C-alpha cells in the first residue's frame, strides 16, 4: 500500500521481530541527530520496497532503546546488521550508496552459486573407530544414491592446544550433483550408531583444491 514498510523496533520487541522472524531482516541502528543515518533513510525506504518479499528492513533508535545495540558491539551509527533465522549473516558500518547497499544485500541474500558434487558427513565417527574398511563401507553405502568418485576420511584437530579434540569429516564426491542431492536428502539428520549425522554440500572449489578445512 501507500504505507510504511519499515519495522519500528524497541528493546522489548527485538527478539520476536528480528530473531524469530521469517526471512532476512536488515536492522538499522540509528538516531535522529545522526547525519549519515538521515542520508541513508530514503535509500532504506527504496530497498524496503524493491526487496519486498525478499527482505524486511527494521530500525532501532538507540537513544530510545539503549539496551540492544551494546549486545551486538555497535559503536558508530548507522550500523546495519543482516539477520537470517536468528543468525547474524553480515554487518556493515557507516553510510553507503544505494548501489553499494544493493551489492551488499545481493551478495549476502544470494545463497550458493552452484550445487556441489561433494557431500560432507559430520559427527559420524570418532577417530578411534576409523579402520581400513571404513572408506570402502562408505563407498558401498553411498553407491545406493549414485556413482561415487572418491571418499576422504579426514581427521581435523579443533584448535592449537595439545589436548585439542580431533573430529572426523567424511567427504563423498559423486559424479554429478543430482546424485549428491539424493544422498544428502536421504542421510541428513539420520542416526548412525547413536550419533545424529549431518550431511550437507561442501564447496566444490575448496574440495578440488585440497582445502578440507570448512
Ligand atoms: Mg558499529
Ligand atoms: Mg562503528
Numbering used by the authors: 343 to 556
What do the authors say?
UHM-ULM interactions mediated by multiple ULMs of SF3b1 and UHM domains from SPF45, PUF60 and CAPER-α play a crucial role in AS. UHM domains were first identified in both subunits of the U2AF heterodimer (U2AF65 and U2AF35). Structural analysis revealed that they represent non-canonical RNA recognition motif (RRM) domains with degenerate RNA binding motifs. Using high-throughput screening (HTS) of a highly curated library of 43296 drug-like molecules with biophysical assays monitoring binding to UHM domains, we identified phenothiazine derivatives as inhibitors of UHM-ULM interactions.
